[PDB]
Amino acid sequence: DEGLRATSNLTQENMPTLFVESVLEVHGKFVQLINTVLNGDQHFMSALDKALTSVVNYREPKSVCKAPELLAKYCDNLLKKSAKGMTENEVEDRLTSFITVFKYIDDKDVFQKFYARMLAKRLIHGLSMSMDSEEAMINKLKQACGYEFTSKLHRMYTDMSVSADLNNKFNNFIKNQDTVIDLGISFQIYVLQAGAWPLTQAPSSTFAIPQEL
Amino acid sequence: NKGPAA
Amino acid sequence: DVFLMIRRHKTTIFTDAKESSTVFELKRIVEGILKRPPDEQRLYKDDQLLDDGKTLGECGFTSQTARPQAPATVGLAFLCIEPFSSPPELPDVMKPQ
Amino acid sequence: MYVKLISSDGHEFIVKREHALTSGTIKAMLSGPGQTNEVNFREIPSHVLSKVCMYFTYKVRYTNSSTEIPEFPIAPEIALELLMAANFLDC
Amino acid sequence: WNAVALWAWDIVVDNCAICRNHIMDLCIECQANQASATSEECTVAWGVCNHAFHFHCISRWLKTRQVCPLDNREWEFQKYG
Amino acid sequence: EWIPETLYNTAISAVVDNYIRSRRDIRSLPENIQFDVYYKLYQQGRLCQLGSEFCELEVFAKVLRALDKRHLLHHCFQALMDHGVKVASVLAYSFSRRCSYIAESDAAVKEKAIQVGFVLGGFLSDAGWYSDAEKVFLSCLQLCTLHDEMLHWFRAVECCVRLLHVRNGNCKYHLGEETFKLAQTYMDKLSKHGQQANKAALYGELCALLFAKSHYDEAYKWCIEAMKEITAGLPVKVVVDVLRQASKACVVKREFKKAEQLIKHAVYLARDHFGSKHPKYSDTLLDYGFYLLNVDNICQSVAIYQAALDIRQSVFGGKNIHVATAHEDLAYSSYVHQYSSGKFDNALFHAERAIGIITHILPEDHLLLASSKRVKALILEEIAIDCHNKETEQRLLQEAHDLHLSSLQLAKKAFGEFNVQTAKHYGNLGRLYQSMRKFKEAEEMHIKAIQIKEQLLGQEDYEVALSVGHLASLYNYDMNQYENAEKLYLRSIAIGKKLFGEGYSGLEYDYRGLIKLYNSIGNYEKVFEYHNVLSNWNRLRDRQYSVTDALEDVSTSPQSTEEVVQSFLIS
Ligand SMILES: [Zn+2]
Ligand SMILES: [Zn+2]
Ligand SMILES: [Zn+2]
Ligand SMILES: [Zn+2]
């Protein structure tokens, strides 16, 4: 009942950030309540975990749950470099508590689809807080949720790490042929795995670049 | 001993 | 989409119209074959005249009863609908002889 | 633009032109000196032709249909005569 | 000119015939023991029957039976990755 | 003493020998006459003439009304499926074809189709052809959702309870959840219009679907929900189906007292109405033997499966999916019974049949192969250990290694990574890798099997204790870090005596592990003590192990239909 009241004034302009902070406030205070006046009883902690599962995994009548999309957006809304108001040291502390609200997600599979697609749009544009934060992000998910949960999500990272080497190998290739070959423009590439990246969609339309490329 | 139950 | 047929004497028009399509505009399609004025012709479902103002969906010719497999029927007049034919009956075989 | 169809009993089956492109035999009626175009279809009765042109509306609408196509009901009593038109019309 | 790239193997059937998993993903042998410490050498191999199989899967098949699982023809490798 | 043949039987053979001329007019015979004409065709071996008329729905409709001789129709139906012609597939397609033709017709003709659909769909569900029973039930469900009347939703709920039964046995668990949700639509609509539909059989089907997906917490929750709505006015087949699948949820919940009072009454109630040679009776024994398999009733667990298979074999012909599942349990029961002796002769043959029957009738990617190929791989593992020739060992272990991962992949696709069955295969692979000398891979598999199975089941479970024993048996021999196995073995005995007592089969390999662990470091003050423990182990279980089967153990039941239901519910 207190959890639903926390996620009641649903501010549409800041839905994901207010959602995780409200649950963190409820969880961060009641973890003290079970510990500062009560003993650390696993019966009471199990009730808190069971109750916070109910409020986070709330399905509207004849509607889907709002939990997986907001948690996917919350990670994107902070790992994006546009909000230059916090540092990576504050990111690690902030996102460590993001694991606690993540463990209450009933449908973690659909969160991965929402996160990977959101990461796909964010990562290929070259915009993010930092590359090691993305490495740390999938590192914490692979230990909190599961080994094969971030199977395609691990390959979301470690793709542009070898792209730089591949670009240098391409730069090595362009300077070692018998003749002189120039592309006429600064060419930068990064290759993606078909079975990992969600970039398939439906390419029903062909394309034919002119002679300039 | 023998194995897991099916 | 709504599919239906109209029979005056022996003709059959397999035309299509939207679920919200009215009655006045489909008479122009009928005019293209019979060469008859739209006000002179009148249509009759289940022994009942259809108004021009009401649509096809307001008289009962909805999608489920007007499927592209077995569409709803409606008469026409200016009823003299002729039955198609009598198919050769099949013995039940399972029935004792 | 409109293709007629007469039957054994004289029933008229005037329908849309492009609904009849499925069967090439109907296009043979339009082709030649036939080019509404008068057609004689005496050997095939009216009741079975009520399902022949009925299949045309089913055929054209479901061409590359995203949803799963429901089967076209063919009554067991009319199964024998309708299959005669299927081979004759190559439909 | 910045550009993305999406790569896939030359296989078309898009499925391994032994592990039954997606050919782009790891084989069942490498999807159980180590998905990060072994995935970098989970390659695939073609054959004279033009049937690209997971290298771990095809080797594990060749441990006992030296015939192609799809069609019963002697299995000879033709190209690797 | 040469009793003359009855004129009824004599006239049967008089028209069978003249079948071709009078083929048309036999269909005009009465149903009791008509069935005996067809049963004689099977007896004479004229399956082609027998199959020449069962392919028609109308002919098979009259034959299905011989309820007394249904046990002969099943044996003839399976004979046709081994004869060639797919009489199950054509009947389902023919019924589904004619079913859609009366959608716009009246409800008088329509109601006959559902009655035909339930007897035919129920028969194919009994015969095991779940892939063809589903197409029958989906057609009759469509009719019930065309005209809105109070009787139509009364049978639409009756389709979804049986639709959810033909999808539990066909391993279509993903579509099973949708049917239950679709069931609640008509079930709640009927409840609003002054008719509280009985949620007993419909809730009883989740006692197997969620049990199959190892949702033991959710299955036991639905075990209680299904058991509440039982009623003495329910059909006995419906009642016994609830008790069987409710008892299974209790066995995996590590509760033994309330499970046996449920399943023994299920055996008693099934034997009473149906008999000792009915398919529903044999379906109870497999669920009953599942209880005996987990309570260390190993001596009669093989016999009860052997009894269960013989019932199905006498009624379900040859290549039938129900015989394979009966073959499956007996193959595994002999695997654990012949563990010390090593006599896996009939164990592999039953396992080989289990592969043989399913591959002919089910697709290669069907999940029932994964369950079936797992046990055969376990047979191949212990066979290679017992064999003296090392060349034989290196081939058979790889063959078993082929089956586990092929089985594991099918489990992974349908159940997800975090499930008991996927972790169940991890435990098998760890033991397999011990025989495969891939000790480092064995360590990886065992920790996977113990960090996943324990994660959702809990710290105290039967299968978790065995998974510890697999890794405890590892550190004793290959890794040789006895300190790791000292804590692991101590967990194995700890959970063993909570429910199974000291005399448990897996604990023998656990007490011996402690002595083997202690023998390496020279400890002897516990070796002498634990040698006395084995002497206590060797006697105390064998003191109370004397030969006693289970068919006379249940005998007549003093407990009645209501005496079992309320006792389990209040406790
Ligand atoms: Zn593979
Ligand atoms: Zn691999
Ligand atoms: Zn091949
Ligand atoms: Zn035959």
Side-chain angles (χ1 to χ4, degrees), chain F residues 277-309:
Chain F
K277 55 153 287 296
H278 203 253
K280 182 53 75 187
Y281 179 61
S282 46
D283 292 1
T284 318
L285 267 68
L286 294 176
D287 296 332
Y288 181 75
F290 185 70
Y291 179 86
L292 316 184
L293 194 145
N294 294 115
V295 304
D296 199 72
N297 217 346
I298 187 168
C299 285
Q300 57 207 85
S301 170
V302 180
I304 195 70
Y305 290 164
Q306 171 77 50
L309 201 163

mmCIF file of all heavy atoms in Angstrom, chain F residues 277-309:
data_model
loop_
_atom_site.group_PDB
_atom_site.id
_atom_site.type_symbol
_atom_site.label_atom_id
_atom_site.label_comp_id
_atom_site.label_asym_id
_atom_site.label_seq_id
_atom_site.Cartn_x
_atom_site.Cartn_y
_atom_site.Cartn_z
ATOM 1 N N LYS F 277 -7.215 -53.063 -16.202
ATOM 2 C CA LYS F 277 -6.628 -53.071 -17.539
ATOM 3 C C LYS F 277 -7.181 -51.916 -18.366
ATOM 4 O O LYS F 277 -7.423 -52.030 -19.569
ATOM 5 C CB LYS F 277 -6.871 -54.410 -18.230
ATOM 6 C CG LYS F 277 -8.332 -54.825 -18.297
ATOM 7 C CD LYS F 277 -8.582 -55.740 -19.483
ATOM 8 C CE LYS F 277 -8.554 -54.965 -20.791
ATOM 9 N NZ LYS F 277 -9.651 -53.963 -20.872
ATOM 10 N N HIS F 278 -7.378 -50.771 -17.717
ATOM 11 C CA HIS F 278 -7.874 -49.578 -18.378
ATOM 12 C C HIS F 278 -6.745 -48.568 -18.554
ATOM 13 O O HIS F 278 -5.834 -48.504 -17.723
ATOM 14 C CB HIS F 278 -9.013 -48.937 -17.576
ATOM 15 C CG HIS F 278 -9.924 -48.077 -18.397
ATOM 16 N ND1 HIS F 278 -9.924 -46.702 -18.315
ATOM 17 C CD2 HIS F 278 -10.860 -48.399 -19.322
ATOM 18 C CE1 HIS F 278 -10.822 -46.214 -19.152
ATOM 19 N NE2 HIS F 278 -11.405 -47.222 -19.775
ATOM 20 N N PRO F 279 -6.765 -47.785 -19.638
ATOM 21 C CA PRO F 279 -5.725 -46.756 -19.811
ATOM 22 C C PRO F 279 -5.667 -45.746 -18.679
ATOM 23 O O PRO F 279 -4.572 -45.308 -18.304
ATOM 24 C CB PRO F 279 -6.108 -46.096 -21.142
ATOM 25 C CG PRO F 279 -6.888 -47.130 -21.870
ATOM 26 C CD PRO F 279 -7.616 -47.924 -20.834
ATOM 27 N N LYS F 280 -6.817 -45.365 -18.118
ATOM 28 C CA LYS F 280 -6.815 -44.416 -17.010
ATOM 29 C C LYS F 280 -6.195 -45.032 -15.761
ATOM 30 O O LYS F 280 -5.545 -44.334 -14.974
ATOM 31 C CB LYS F 280 -8.236 -43.929 -16.730
ATOM 32 C CG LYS F 280 -8.340 -42.897 -15.618
ATOM 33 C CD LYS F 280 -7.401 -41.728 -15.865
ATOM 34 C CE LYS F 280 -7.931 -40.815 -16.956
ATOM 35 N NZ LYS F 280 -6.944 -39.761 -17.317
ATOM 36 N N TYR F 281 -6.391 -46.337 -15.562
ATOM 37 C CA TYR F 281 -5.748 -47.015 -14.442
ATOM 38 C C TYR F 281 -4.231 -47.001 -14.589
ATOM 39 O O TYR F 281 -3.510 -46.726 -13.624
ATOM 40 C CB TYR F 281 -6.265 -48.449 -14.332
ATOM 41 C CG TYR F 281 -5.646 -49.246 -13.208
ATOM 42 C CD1 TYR F 281 -5.779 -48.840 -11.887
ATOM 43 C CD2 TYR F 281 -4.936 -50.409 -13.466
ATOM 44 C CE1 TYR F 281 -5.220 -49.568 -10.855
ATOM 45 C CE2 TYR F 281 -4.372 -51.144 -12.442
ATOM 46 C CZ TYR F 281 -4.518 -50.720 -11.139
ATOM 47 O OH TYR F 281 -3.955 -51.451 -10.119
ATOM 48 N N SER F 282 -3.731 -47.281 -15.796
ATOM 49 C CA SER F 282 -2.289 -47.259 -16.024
ATOM 50 C C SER F 282 -1.723 -45.851 -15.909
ATOM 51 O O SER F 282 -0.571 -45.682 -15.493
ATOM 52 C CB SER F 282 -1.962 -47.847 -17.394
ATOM 53 O OG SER F 282 -2.826 -47.327 -18.388
ATOM 54 N N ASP F 283 -2.505 -44.835 -16.284
ATOM 55 C CA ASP F 283 -2.063 -43.457 -16.101
ATOM 56 C C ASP F 283 -1.888 -43.121 -14.627
ATOM 57 O O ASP F 283 -1.061 -42.271 -14.276
ATOM 58 C CB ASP F 283 -3.056 -42.492 -16.749
ATOM 59 C CG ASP F 283 -3.071 -42.595 -18.262
ATOM 60 O OD1 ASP F 283 -2.316 -43.424 -18.811
ATOM 61 O OD2 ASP F 283 -3.840 -41.847 -18.903
ATOM 62 N N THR F 284 -2.655 -43.773 -13.752
ATOM 63 C CA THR F 284 -2.510 -43.538 -12.320
ATOM 64 C C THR F 284 -1.248 -44.197 -11.777
ATOM 65 O O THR F 284 -0.568 -43.626 -10.917
ATOM 66 C CB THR F 284 -3.743 -44.048 -11.578
ATOM 67 O OG1 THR F 284 -4.922 -43.686 -12.307
ATOM 68 C CG2 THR F 284 -3.813 -43.443 -10.188
ATOM 69 N N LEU F 285 -0.919 -45.395 -12.271
ATOM 70 C CA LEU F 285 0.245 -46.120 -11.770
ATOM 71 C C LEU F 285 1.542 -45.371 -12.053
ATOM 72 O O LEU F 285 2.442 -45.340 -11.204
ATOM 73 C CB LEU F 285 0.294 -47.521 -12.378
ATOM 74 C CG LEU F 285 -0.359 -48.661 -11.593
ATOM 75 C CD1 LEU F 285 -1.861 -48.504 -11.531
ATOM 76 C CD2 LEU F 285 0.010 -50.000 -12.214
ATOM 77 N N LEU F 286 1.665 -44.775 -13.242
ATOM 78 C CA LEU F 286 2.860 -43.995 -13.551
ATOM 79 C C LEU F 286 3.001 -42.812 -12.604
ATOM 80 O O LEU F 286 4.104 -42.512 -12.131
ATOM 81 C CB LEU F 286 2.824 -43.522 -15.003
ATOM 82 C CG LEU F 286 2.906 -44.618 -16.065
ATOM 83 C CD1 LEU F 286 2.760 -44.024 -17.452
ATOM 84 C CD2 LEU F 286 4.216 -45.379 -15.941
ATOM 85 N N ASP F 287 1.895 -42.126 -12.316
ATOM 86 C CA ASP F 287 1.926 -41.079 -11.302
ATOM 87 C C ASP F 287 2.108 -41.673 -9.910
ATOM 88 O O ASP F 287 2.778 -41.077 -9.059
ATOM 89 C CB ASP F 287 0.650 -40.242 -11.377
ATOM 90 C CG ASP F 287 0.521 -39.500 -12.693
ATOM 91 O OD1 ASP F 287 1.563 -39.190 -13.307
ATOM 92 O OD2 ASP F 287 -0.621 -39.227 -13.118
ATOM 93 N N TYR F 288 1.512 -42.842 -9.659
ATOM 94 C CA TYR F 288 1.716 -43.514 -8.380
ATOM 95 C C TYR F 288 3.152 -43.989 -8.225
ATOM 96 O O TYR F 288 3.744 -43.857 -7.147
ATOM 97 C CB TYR F 288 0.752 -44.690 -8.235
ATOM 98 C CG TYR F 288 0.887 -45.415 -6.920
ATOM 99 C CD1 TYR F 288 0.392 -44.861 -5.749
ATOM 100 C CD2 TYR F 288 1.512 -46.650 -6.847
ATOM 101 C CE1 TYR F 288 0.514 -45.516 -4.542
ATOM 102 C CE2 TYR F 288 1.639 -47.310 -5.646
ATOM 103 C CZ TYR F 288 1.139 -46.742 -4.497
ATOM 104 O OH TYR F 288 1.264 -47.403 -3.296
ATOM 105 N N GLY F 289 3.729 -44.550 -9.287
ATOM 106 C CA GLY F 289 5.114 -44.972 -9.222
ATOM 107 C C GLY F 289 6.093 -43.825 -9.128
ATOM 108 O O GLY F 289 7.222 -44.025 -8.667
ATOM 109 N N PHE F 290 5.691 -42.631 -9.568
ATOM 110 C CA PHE F 290 6.511 -41.447 -9.340
ATOM 111 C C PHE F 290 6.669 -41.179 -7.850
ATOM 112 O O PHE F 290 7.742 -40.766 -7.396
ATOM 113 C CB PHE F 290 5.899 -40.239 -10.047
ATOM 114 C CG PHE F 290 6.738 -38.997 -9.961
ATOM 115 C CD1 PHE F 290 7.940 -38.910 -10.644
ATOM 116 C CD2 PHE F 290 6.325 -37.917 -9.199
ATOM 117 C CE1 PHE F 290 8.716 -37.770 -10.567
ATOM 118 C CE2 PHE F 290 7.096 -36.773 -9.118
ATOM 119 C CZ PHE F 290 8.293 -36.700 -9.804
ATOM 120 N N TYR F 291 5.605 -41.402 -7.076
ATOM 121 C CA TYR F 291 5.709 -41.298 -5.624
ATOM 122 C C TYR F 291 6.672 -42.340 -5.068
ATOM 123 O O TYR F 291 7.538 -42.022 -4.245
ATOM 124 C CB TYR F 291 4.327 -41.441 -4.984
ATOM 125 C CG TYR F 291 4.344 -41.358 -3.473
ATOM 126 C CD1 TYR F 291 4.284 -40.133 -2.825
ATOM 127 C CD2 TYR F 291 4.403 -42.510 -2.695
ATOM 128 C CE1 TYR F 291 4.301 -40.055 -1.445
ATOM 129 C CE2 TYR F 291 4.420 -42.440 -1.316
ATOM 130 C CZ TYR F 291 4.367 -41.210 -0.697
ATOM 131 O OH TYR F 291 4.381 -41.134 0.677
ATOM 132 N N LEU F 292 6.543 -43.593 -5.514
ATOM 133 C CA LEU F 292 7.417 -44.649 -5.010
ATOM 134 C C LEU F 292 8.860 -44.444 -5.449
ATOM 135 O O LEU F 292 9.785 -44.893 -4.760
ATOM 136 C CB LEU F 292 6.920 -46.020 -5.467
ATOM 137 C CG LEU F 292 5.423 -46.325 -5.394
ATOM 138 C CD1 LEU F 292 5.171 -47.768 -5.799
ATOM 139 C CD2 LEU F 292 4.875 -46.058 -4.000
ATOM 140 N N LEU F 293 9.075 -43.777 -6.585
ATOM 141 C CA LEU F 293 10.433 -43.539 -7.057
ATOM 142 C C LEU F 293 11.170 -42.542 -6.170
ATOM 143 O O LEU F 293 12.389 -42.653 -5.999
ATOM 144 C CB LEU F 293 10.400 -43.052 -8.508
ATOM 145 C CG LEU F 293 11.702 -43.045 -9.315
ATOM 146 C CD1 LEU F 293 11.412 -43.373 -10.770
ATOM 147 C CD2 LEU F 293 12.416 -41.703 -9.216
ATOM 148 N N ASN F 294 10.456 -41.572 -5.598
ATOM 149 C CA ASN F 294 11.086 -40.520 -4.813
ATOM 150 C C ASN F 294 11.101 -40.792 -3.314
ATOM 151 O O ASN F 294 11.868 -40.144 -2.597
ATOM 152 C CB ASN F 294 10.391 -39.178 -5.070
ATOM 153 C CG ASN F 294 10.577 -38.687 -6.492
ATOM 154 O OD1 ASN F 294 9.617 -38.582 -7.255
ATOM 155 N ND2 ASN F 294 11.817 -38.385 -6.857
ATOM 156 N N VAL F 295 10.283 -41.718 -2.823
ATOM 157 C CA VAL F 295 10.277 -42.068 -1.406
ATOM 158 C C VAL F 295 11.197 -43.256 -1.120
ATOM 159 O O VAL F 295 11.102 -43.870 -0.058
ATOM 160 C CB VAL F 295 8.852 -42.330 -0.891
ATOM 161 C CG1 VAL F 295 7.962 -41.124 -1.148
ATOM 162 C CG2 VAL F 295 8.269 -43.584 -1.530
ATOM 163 N N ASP F 296 12.089 -43.583 -2.060
ATOM 164 C CA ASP F 296 13.009 -44.720 -1.953
ATOM 165 C C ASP F 296 12.247 -46.035 -1.794
ATOM 166 O O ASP F 296 12.677 -46.945 -1.083
ATOM 167 C CB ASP F 296 14.018 -44.520 -0.816
ATOM 168 C CG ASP F 296 15.242 -45.408 -0.959
ATOM 169 O OD1 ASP F 296 16.071 -45.139 -1.853
ATOM 170 O OD2 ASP F 296 15.375 -46.370 -0.175
ATOM 171 N N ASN F 297 11.098 -46.132 -2.458
ATOM 172 C CA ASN F 297 10.387 -47.402 -2.591
ATOM 173 C C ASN F 297 10.816 -48.089 -3.889
ATOM 174 O O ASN F 297 10.010 -48.470 -4.737
ATOM 175 C CB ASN F 297 8.880 -47.178 -2.543
ATOM 176 C CG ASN F 297 8.154 -48.279 -1.800
ATOM 177 O OD1 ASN F 297 8.722 -49.336 -1.529
ATOM 178 N ND2 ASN F 297 6.892 -48.038 -1.468
ATOM 179 N N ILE F 298 12.136 -48.244 -4.012
ATOM 180 C CA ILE F 298 12.760 -48.608 -5.280
ATOM 181 C C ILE F 298 12.393 -50.025 -5.707
ATOM 182 O O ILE F 298 12.287 -50.305 -6.908
ATOM 183 C CB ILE F 298 14.286 -48.406 -5.173
ATOM 184 C CG1 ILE F 298 14.971 -48.609 -6.525
ATOM 185 C CG2 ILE F 298 14.893 -49.305 -4.098
ATOM 186 C CD1 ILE F 298 16.408 -48.147 -6.537
ATOM 187 N N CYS F 299 12.197 -50.938 -4.752
ATOM 188 C CA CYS F 299 11.948 -52.336 -5.096
ATOM 189 C C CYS F 299 10.636 -52.501 -5.853
ATOM 190 O O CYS F 299 10.575 -53.218 -6.859
ATOM 191 C CB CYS F 299 11.956 -53.194 -3.831
ATOM 192 S SG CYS F 299 13.604 -53.505 -3.155
ATOM 193 N N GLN F 300 9.574 -51.843 -5.392
ATOM 194 C CA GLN F 300 8.285 -51.925 -6.067
ATOM 195 C C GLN F 300 8.050 -50.791 -7.055
ATOM 196 O O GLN F 300 7.050 -50.826 -7.780
ATOM 197 C CB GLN F 300 7.146 -51.959 -5.041
ATOM 198 C CG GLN F 300 7.118 -50.782 -4.088
ATOM 199 C CD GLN F 300 6.469 -51.134 -2.764
ATOM 200 O OE1 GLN F 300 7.123 -51.646 -1.855
ATOM 201 N NE2 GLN F 300 5.174 -50.863 -2.649
ATOM 202 N N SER F 301 8.934 -49.791 -7.102
ATOM 203 C CA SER F 301 8.801 -48.739 -8.105
ATOM 204 C C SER F 301 9.037 -49.286 -9.506
ATOM 205 O O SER F 301 8.397 -48.847 -10.469
ATOM 206 C CB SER F 301 9.767 -47.593 -7.807
ATOM 207 O OG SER F 301 9.811 -46.672 -8.882
ATOM 208 N N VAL F 302 9.967 -50.232 -9.643
ATOM 209 C CA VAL F 302 10.163 -50.897 -10.926
ATOM 210 C C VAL F 302 8.961 -51.770 -11.259
ATOM 211 O O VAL F 302 8.496 -51.802 -12.405
ATOM 212 C CB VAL F 302 11.469 -51.709 -10.906
ATOM 213 C CG1 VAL F 302 11.686 -52.413 -12.237
ATOM 214 C CG2 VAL F 302 12.643 -50.808 -10.573
ATOM 215 N N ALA F 303 8.441 -52.492 -10.264
ATOM 216 C CA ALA F 303 7.302 -53.375 -10.494
ATOM 217 C C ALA F 303 6.052 -52.591 -10.871
ATOM 218 O O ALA F 303 5.303 -53.003 -11.767
ATOM 219 C CB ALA F 303 7.045 -54.231 -9.254
ATOM 220 N N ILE F 304 5.802 -51.465 -10.198
ATOM 221 C CA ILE F 304 4.596 -50.692 -10.484
ATOM 222 C C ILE F 304 4.664 -50.075 -11.880
ATOM 223 O O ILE F 304 3.640 -49.969 -12.564
ATOM 224 C CB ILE F 304 4.356 -49.641 -9.380
ATOM 225 C CG1 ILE F 304 2.931 -49.095 -9.453
ATOM 226 C CG2 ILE F 304 5.370 -48.518 -9.435
ATOM 227 C CD1 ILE F 304 1.884 -50.097 -9.036
ATOM 228 N N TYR F 305 5.855 -49.664 -12.329
ATOM 229 C CA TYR F 305 6.028 -49.273 -13.726
ATOM 230 C C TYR F 305 5.895 -50.470 -14.658
ATOM 231 O O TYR F 305 5.315 -50.355 -15.743
ATOM 232 C CB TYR F 305 7.380 -48.591 -13.926
ATOM 233 C CG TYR F 305 7.501 -47.221 -13.301
ATOM 234 C CD1 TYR F 305 8.744 -46.637 -13.113
ATOM 235 C CD2 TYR F 305 6.380 -46.515 -12.895
ATOM 236 C CE1 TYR F 305 8.870 -45.387 -12.546
ATOM 237 C CE2 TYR F 305 6.496 -45.258 -12.335
ATOM 238 C CZ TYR F 305 7.745 -44.702 -12.157
ATOM 239 O OH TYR F 305 7.872 -43.453 -11.594
ATOM 240 N N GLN F 306 6.442 -51.621 -14.259
ATOM 241 C CA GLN F 306 6.291 -52.827 -15.066
ATOM 242 C C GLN F 306 4.826 -53.227 -15.175
ATOM 243 O O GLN F 306 4.362 -53.634 -16.247
ATOM 244 C CB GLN F 306 7.122 -53.965 -14.472
ATOM 245 C CG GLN F 306 6.876 -55.317 -15.115
ATOM 246 C CD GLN F 306 7.556 -55.453 -16.463
ATOM 247 O OE1 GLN F 306 8.746 -55.172 -16.600
ATOM 248 N NE2 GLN F 306 6.801 -55.881 -17.467
ATOM 249 N N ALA F 307 4.081 -53.112 -14.073
ATOM 250 C CA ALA F 307 2.640 -53.326 -14.130
ATOM 251 C C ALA F 307 1.959 -52.269 -14.992
ATOM 252 O O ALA F 307 1.050 -52.586 -15.767
ATOM 253 C CB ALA F 307 2.053 -53.330 -12.720
ATOM 254 N N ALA F 308 2.389 -51.009 -14.872
ATOM 255 C CA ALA F 308 1.775 -49.932 -15.644
ATOM 256 C C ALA F 308 1.993 -50.121 -17.138
ATOM 257 O O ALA F 308 1.078 -49.896 -17.940
ATOM 258 C CB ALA F 308 2.328 -48.580 -15.195
ATOM 259 N N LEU F 309 3.202 -50.524 -17.534
ATOM 260 C CA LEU F 309 3.495 -50.716 -18.952
ATOM 261 C C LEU F 309 2.674 -51.862 -19.532
ATOM 262 O O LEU F 309 2.198 -51.777 -20.670
ATOM 263 C CB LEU F 309 4.995 -50.960 -19.141
ATOM 264 C CG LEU F 309 5.667 -50.724 -20.500
ATOM 265 C CD1 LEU F 309 7.166 -50.638 -20.300
ATOM 266 C CD2 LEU F 309 5.352 -51.806 -21.526
#
